[PDB]
Design an enzyme around this catalytic site. Sequence first.
Site, PDB file in Angstrom:
ATOM      1  N   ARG C   1       0.795  -1.217   0.000  1.00  0.00           N
ATOM      2  CA  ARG C   1       0.000   0.000   0.000  1.00  0.00           C
ATOM      3  C   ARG C   1       0.831   1.271   0.000  1.00  0.00           C
ATOM      4  O   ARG C   1       0.268   2.354  -0.195  1.00  0.00           O
ATOM      5  CB  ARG C   1      -0.950   0.000   1.200  1.00  0.00           C
ATOM      6  CG  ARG C   1      -1.642  -1.335   1.402  1.00  0.00           C
ATOM      7  CD  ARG C   1      -2.399  -1.390   2.711  1.00  0.00           C
ATOM      8  NE  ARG C   1      -3.498  -2.346   2.658  1.00  0.00           N
ATOM      9  CZ  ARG C   1      -4.143  -2.802   3.722  1.00  0.00           C
ATOM     10  NH1 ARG C   1      -3.818  -2.419   4.946  1.00  0.00           N
ATOM     11  NH2 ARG C   1      -5.140  -3.667   3.555  1.00  0.00           N
TER      12      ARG C   1
ATOM     13  N   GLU I 735      -3.139 -11.077   7.364  1.00  0.00           N
ATOM     14  CA  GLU I 735      -3.705 -10.154   6.384  1.00  0.00           C
ATOM     15  C   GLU I 735      -4.454  -9.056   7.128  1.00  0.00           C
ATOM     16  O   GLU I 735      -5.611  -9.238   7.518  1.00  0.00           O
ATOM     17  CB  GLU I 735      -4.615 -10.886   5.404  1.00  0.00           C
ATOM     18  CG  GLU I 735      -3.870 -11.840   4.485  1.00  0.00           C
ATOM     19  CD  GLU I 735      -4.551 -12.015   3.143  1.00  0.00           C
ATOM     20  OE1 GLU I 735      -5.327 -11.121   2.747  1.00  0.00           O
ATOM     21  OE2 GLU I 735      -4.312 -13.050   2.483  1.00  0.00           O
ATOM     22  N   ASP I 736      -3.768  -7.935   7.359  1.00  0.00           N
ATOM     23  CA  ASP I 736      -4.353  -6.728   7.936  1.00  0.00           C
ATOM     24  C   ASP I 736      -4.768  -6.931   9.386  1.00  0.00           C
ATOM     25  O   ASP I 736      -5.215  -5.987  10.043  1.00  0.00           O
ATOM     26  CB  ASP I 736      -5.551  -6.259   7.106  1.00  0.00           C
ATOM     27  CG  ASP I 736      -5.181  -5.965   5.670  1.00  0.00           C
ATOM     28  OD1 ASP I 736      -4.013  -5.604   5.421  1.00  0.00           O
ATOM     29  OD2 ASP I 736      -6.058  -6.092   4.791  1.00  0.00           O
ATOM     30  N   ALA I 737      -4.622  -8.148   9.897  1.00  0.00           N
ATOM     31  CA  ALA I 737      -4.914  -8.390  11.297  1.00  0.00           C
ATOM     32  C   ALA I 737      -3.847  -7.741  12.168  1.00  0.00           C
ATOM     33  O   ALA I 737      -2.728  -7.469  11.729  1.00  0.00           O
ATOM     34  CB  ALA I 737      -5.000  -9.887  11.583  1.00  0.00           C
ATOM     35  N   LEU I 738      -4.214  -7.479  13.417  1.00  0.00           N
ATOM     36  CA  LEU I 738      -3.319  -6.809  14.345  1.00  0.00           C
ATOM     37  C   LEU I 738      -3.705  -7.198  15.760  1.00  0.00           C
ATOM     38  O   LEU I 738      -4.891  -7.257  16.092  1.00  0.00           O
ATOM     39  CB  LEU I 738      -3.360  -5.289  14.128  1.00  0.00           C
ATOM     40  CG  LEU I 738      -4.675  -4.520  14.279  1.00  0.00           C
ATOM     41  CD1 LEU I 738      -4.969  -4.136  15.715  1.00  0.00           C
ATOM     42  CD2 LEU I 738      -4.660  -3.289  13.389  1.00  0.00           C
TER      43      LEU I 738
END
Lengths: 65, 125, 99, 394, 149, 120, 56, 248, 772
Positions: C1, I735-738
Amino acid sequence: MIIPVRCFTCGKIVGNKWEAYLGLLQAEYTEGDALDALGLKRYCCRRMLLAHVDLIEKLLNYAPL
Amino acid sequence: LPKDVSVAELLRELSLTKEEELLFLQLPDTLPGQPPTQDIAENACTLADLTEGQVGKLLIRKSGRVQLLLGKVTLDVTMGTACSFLQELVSVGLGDSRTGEMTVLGHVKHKLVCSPDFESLLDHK
Amino acid sequence: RMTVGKLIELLAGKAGVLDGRFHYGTAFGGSKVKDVCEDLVRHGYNYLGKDYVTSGITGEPLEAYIYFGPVYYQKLKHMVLDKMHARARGPRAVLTRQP
Amino acid sequence: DDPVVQEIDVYLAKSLAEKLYLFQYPVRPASMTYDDIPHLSAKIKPKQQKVELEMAIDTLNPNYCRSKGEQIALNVDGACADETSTYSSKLMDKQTFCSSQTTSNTSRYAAALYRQGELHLTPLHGILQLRPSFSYLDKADAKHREREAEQARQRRVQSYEFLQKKHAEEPWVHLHYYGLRDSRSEHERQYLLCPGSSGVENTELVKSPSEYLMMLMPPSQPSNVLSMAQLRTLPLADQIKILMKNVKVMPFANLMSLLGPSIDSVAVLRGIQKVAMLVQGNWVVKSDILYPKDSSSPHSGVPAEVLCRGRDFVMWKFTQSRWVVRKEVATVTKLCAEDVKDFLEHMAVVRINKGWEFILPYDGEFIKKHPDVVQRQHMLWTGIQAKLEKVYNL
Amino acid sequence: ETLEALILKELSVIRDHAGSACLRELDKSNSPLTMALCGSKGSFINISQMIACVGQQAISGSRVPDGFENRSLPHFEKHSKLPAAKGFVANSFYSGLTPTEFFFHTMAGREGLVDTAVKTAETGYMQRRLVKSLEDLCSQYDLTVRSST
Amino acid sequence: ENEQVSRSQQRGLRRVRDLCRVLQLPPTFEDTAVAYYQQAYRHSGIRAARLQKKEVLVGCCVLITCRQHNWPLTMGAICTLLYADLDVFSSTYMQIVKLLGLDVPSLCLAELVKTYCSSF
Amino acid sequence: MLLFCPGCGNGLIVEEGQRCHRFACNTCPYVHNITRKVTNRKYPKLKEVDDVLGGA
Amino acid sequence: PGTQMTLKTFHFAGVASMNITLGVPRIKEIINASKAISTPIITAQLDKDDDADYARLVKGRIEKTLLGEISEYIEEVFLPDDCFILVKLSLERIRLLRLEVNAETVRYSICTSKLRVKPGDVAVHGEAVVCVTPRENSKSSMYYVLQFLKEDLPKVVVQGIPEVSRAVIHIDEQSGKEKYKLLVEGDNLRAVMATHGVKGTRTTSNNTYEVEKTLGIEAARTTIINEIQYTMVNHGMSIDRRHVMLLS
Amino acid sequence: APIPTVEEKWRLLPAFLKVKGLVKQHIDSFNYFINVEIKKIMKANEKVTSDADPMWYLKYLNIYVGLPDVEESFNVTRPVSPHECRLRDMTYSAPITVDIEYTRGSQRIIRNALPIGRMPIMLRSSNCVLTGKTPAEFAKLNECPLDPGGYFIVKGVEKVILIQEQLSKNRIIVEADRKGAVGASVTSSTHEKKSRTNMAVKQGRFYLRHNTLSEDIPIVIIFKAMGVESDQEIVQMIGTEEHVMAAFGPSLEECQKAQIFTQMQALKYIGNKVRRQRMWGGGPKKTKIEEARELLASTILTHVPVKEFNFRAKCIYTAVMVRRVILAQGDNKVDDRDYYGNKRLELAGQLLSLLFEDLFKKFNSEMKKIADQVIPKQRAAQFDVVKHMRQDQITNGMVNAISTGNWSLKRFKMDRQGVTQVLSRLSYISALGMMTRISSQFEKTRKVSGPRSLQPSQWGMLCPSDTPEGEACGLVKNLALMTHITTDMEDGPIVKLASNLGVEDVNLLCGEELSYPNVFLVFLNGNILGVIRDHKKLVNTFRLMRRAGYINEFVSISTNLTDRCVYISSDGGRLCRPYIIVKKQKPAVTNKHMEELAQGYRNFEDFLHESLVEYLDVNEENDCNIALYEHTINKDTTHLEIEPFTLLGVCAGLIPYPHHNQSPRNTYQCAMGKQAMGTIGYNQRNRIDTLMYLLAYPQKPMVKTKTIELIEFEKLPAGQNATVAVMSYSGYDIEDALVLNKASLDRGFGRCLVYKNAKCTLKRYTNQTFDK
Ligand SMILES: [Zn+2]
Ligand SMILES: [Zn+2]
């Protein structure tokens, strides 16, 4: 709204130091030296004290009373 | 064919040629005067409301600039659109109630435009 | 991104909370990287934010330096407590006998 | 760039002011002229100016198709009726030009007969555009067709029929046309000039350029609200009040530039003392001006009378010294930090390790010039100080 | 069109040379370099854009069209075909962008988003029609594909 | 039903509607007024009456309506919107209340003052 | 080229008369015998370019 | 793959021109079996693929050329005795494009769907000069119909297949040898195959319906398979040939 | 030698926000409506007179809107705070009073204050009780001082009228068709009619097409009917270039094919081709001799005026149209609809004016119908208008139109939907962003992908990176931080100054003059003022006059050299943006001026008056050259940009360092910020909404944009500053997890509160019984 009692990361008691902090800003004191006077070595406590907004007084202005 | 400018136009029609010529010009809406006892409110002071005699001064400045000093104010004179068709200036002399003299006076070759130098008026005050 | 803005914001926030200021991230301007680097080094931290970090589990230092910093997180309205749904037999429609 | 050549005299004439019409044919190039075509008739309506020309067209010329002319004359009129025949002969004898009106007003247009170095102008009575009429074809069509064969509110004003009736009332005025070769044309031409002396001062056209700009372009006619252009229209005392309200701390010299040097010093010094109070050689607006009695603190809501006392005490403090302690003010005034901050921000700037300093330098120059005013303010301060001492118990 | 192609080639080779210089200059154990080398996420193009230079911002395989009369933006002169004046971004993501560069980059992004938004519905309709048509075909035990009949 | 509504009854209910509208009353008042009108129109002697009778009947119906849900309104203010005289209005009101015998609460003086004082 | 009648301003057309061909008006007897040749070149634009392809 | 295909561009396909509708809409056409398609591409092989002169010759042979495109100038000539229209062919441009066109060729091309102009009307005086003199057809036909002829006389076809719009040479960049293929944006495969100097055995097309009507259903199936695989590869995503073979 | 820089130039932005900015568009539009447009509408329909029994009339004299009031008390009114209307589910409105005069019995009786309805009152407007109040007064009225306002309250819900974006009317649009044939169209729209006419070249000859006409007519026939009869005039008047006559020849041949040579013949032909589109008549009218003339006079090119059956100006306009079509048929220079020079914005004022005018017309028509029904027959009981002033008409119409969001005005045949939307109160920034939202005229008519693109014309007026991701991506836009919208003007002094400046009247000249290259046309909002030479002199003089204040500063002038035209745009709804003037490579702004602005010696209006900062429109900025910084200034820099960061909108303002990010990330962040979790206002405790989210311990951002300070976002924050570590851990963040820290969550981090309302009603029915 109100100052949180504990720092989110470390957990040091920060709730009590808020009021006197405003006293320090009440005088000539700047932000950084005031935080040093209060004894906030790590930057998480300094963040919590600095970034806080005292919305509680504005809301109390709207309280029934 | 070349497209002339007021300085060139007046120069050729005066210096090279002594023959009188018929011009047609559009003045601004209102002239820099007041209708003399014509029952006026800053109304339309046109060419008709004025009187005979000398009325204005035409100045051909250097670098081709042409102006019309009309007292205290200085109008700017420019070429109108160059009409190539027939424009004849006639006189309709109604000598009698049911009789009139159609008197052609001459052809109209050039058209002039007069406009106030609004920049001069503004930077004046 | 390619969100370098997040890294710059993290660095600026660390510098600000260290020196008690509020750095600006105004579009086409704002505080530059050099200033926040100087603020960081003056206060006794690494000038790129990366810090030496020991693993909580093993107790051993990490091989690579880690990137600490205070960032602005905003919680969203979409929460699992409202979106979770399970369906038993349940009701049916009068016209077509379907859920 | 001087008027290097031909300072040209311009004259006005009125001999033919009402007799002058400008006729233009959009379809006819300037190359060809109607000076060779003998004209037959000219019908005009002076009111509702609509000229109508009829000029003879030759037939023996090689450009006339007499076979077509006979047929068209046969169509336009009867075979032998001839009581009202557009063309007397069996051919098309003449051509008719109809007119259209260009503009309602022709005042702004002028005809310029430019002589040898001198120019003569004449206003135009009207301008008409002449086009060859085709009404004869419609007449032929009409002849062929005839041979083959307390009411509700209306609007006849916007009806073309009533318009035609209104124009139909005007009686036609027959005219004798005189061509360019006619000596009468030359005789009437000389009237375009005006008999007058070469140099006479014009009694008219005296208006100033500012007056001309005004007359050709006629007018249609926060608490700061008003702009400077609006401000300068107000009375001097009001201008002092509003300007001093805007800035709330303002040196006397700048006020002279702000209002303008055209205003006398004493008059300015007279109004400023009504609304502004002197501190350290600088004028500060009075508290009641910033806080009208019907107003209150925007942050705490305390009445303006309290704000008047608090602000004056801070203002009085600056007379004693250049530095004001923010904490002590709150202790004495018992006001919230928000209101206290508002007072200081208006007239003081923060100084590190020193508290608050007066925003402006000590202007002793104004003090030396007008010691009488300096003394006057001192007694006023003593009266103010007496009020505060009994209130806050200093 | 020849001029446009030449300018596009020149700007592309500028970007590629800058990216090559970046990659050669980078040290090992660099996080973006590692993540691009193993192919887990990103590529060398992204690294060059974030460090060296964002390439020419192309809309529909061409430079930014003249929204105004003969000008991409009012900030450039009439009939100006300079690199920046038609869409190229000289700066890198680290250095930040100038307002014109930011505007053009947003142009490209919105183009991509609109393309995706229409392609989703187009493919949905394609899939439903095709599955209606070709559903009934199956391979029998004699290894011959037979229709419903 | 709803089709046996002669021109006269339609005119009457439309009059009731526009009258309760010009007074700026809630829709519940309109509903109650039209219901009371439809109830009073069941008598043979009522339907067979002159225009004045139907108008004063509409007036009395809206009066009773506003009376129940404790809304004071003097008869004068109602007759002011009717093309009739108050003398026949009173007689017809008495005639209908003697025939229908519906609940007629008393005009509250407190609300009447609250309504009338604000008019100054 | 589009010729218009000087007599009345309408569009002249081409036709054939008795001595020669004439431009004629459909509304008035104005005619003009074509005394000698008259031409109206158009000079249409040609197919200049060829554009072989396969370049880099 | 329709989800996977992002409608990419700049895929000039080695010719830097000839925009070809690819991606999902292309598939939308192919499955629809539409008789009329957008950008119909016809690939032709040449017997003498090396000579660029021969390539240009055959290109002009197939490509439809208008009278105006080759005529250097056209003038309406009005004379006292009569009126007509004269046209001078640009023999320079003619031999530059080496089209087999002369005064007689254009004369024979004329007299075809042009107000039934008779062969006696047209005459060829010089090598490049051609004159046409119309008459009064009386079918709303005054002699001023000359203008009408001048309106559409340049719009007559003199050489090439009428349905063919634009043909382009395309070199093959193989290092071993260089060959010239011919791309045609036309709608008549049979005419292209019939033309001299074209390897009609190895000529292909894009319109599946045209291939079906010209060469047979099996050739149509092969063309469908090739077209789908080509459009599929052009977007980088890959499908086993068995799926598209089954679909075809 | 770097150019000296006024570093405090950004100080212009707050001062501008003092006068205009975010919400001031809506508030100004609504105040202008309720103070001017309502009176104008009353003037339009001042008198109504019954057809039956004349000498009876009703004359409106004056109209007023009063103060927001509640009628809960029995025939008594009382002031009501907007929060109270929120709580009781009522429309925060004000009574509409009017003074009238009428003759009940041939006697003139007047009324002074007669209600006719209730007008909803937009918050913070002129009449709203909140305007001009202190924060303490706001607290006493239970309202947030930071509430933007600018939204109506109906039945307790907050509704916002989205600003409508539409094509500008009365402009020539040349564009290709589906078949690729280039044609023309103009939507001549007036209050009387809004009709569009088209021009086609289908057979190489031009036909004019209109809805009222059965078949498109060759344009030469229209000219012949129109007053001009000689073909030479028409050919001179279209253009004298050789290709122009070449293109126009087929039309002349077609017109000569028919035997039309007289205005009468062409009028007869048109009347034959004109259908009996009978509106409400068909008897008093004439035939193919009067209907054709009237159709030419009014229906065709309505905005072009004819003084008295003198079509010369309209002839000139259609000749210009034909020339534009012919010229565009060569170099395919085709207009693009996304260029905002041809776009207009409609605020609440214009829409409410249209709706109120339609409601007033319908109410007056209903009153006339009632009078006609009852006046001639009943009795000597003198009918009077007072007995039938049905109040609920206007109030109910406005309430329904605002609440449902669909607007049906039959008088303009316009049926819109979704004009109003429920104000989303998820967060303060969400409220502001929705307050500055703009809708599109299409509402997804077709997925063309053209208008959805971000064309360059949006520069400096709409946020580039702020669009709602989804089906509306690119179809819904937001106003930039620093922008202003024009209001309707007077159009008189513009004509006066133009005529004085040397433009020659079009009626005077023939059509040949249009062909000359140096001759320029001038248009005033689509109407031809005439022709003039030396267009640069005219433009410079006009701009200089505008700077001096003799001309309204929002009047803009632009030059199209390609068409050799000059457009003087004065209508409202155009986008305007302030700019710093630069002459001889130096800005008009000096550090002394910024010092004065800091001291309060002068405000933004003072800068406007002293020719230091001037507004710019899209059309005018198309011609002038602009610079972004002092070092960028060259010789040909008329204007200097005030602040580049005003380019982004309010939502994008929250993004720190947005120039360092890829734009789709900025768009996602705008959409996310519109959905943030945080405080709403100082009155959120008293507020009772359908759904509300509060953050337990909100904190102001540690890194803030100047826009945050401008909108005072830090006063009502919507997030928390948390110590994040950029690393991989446990593989649970694929995937975009935190991951979060359990201790931090225990210590209140991210703690949130959800508030839901539950409401019930206890009615009393038509029967004297009630829910208990
Ligand atoms: Zn901490
Ligand atoms: Zn003629």
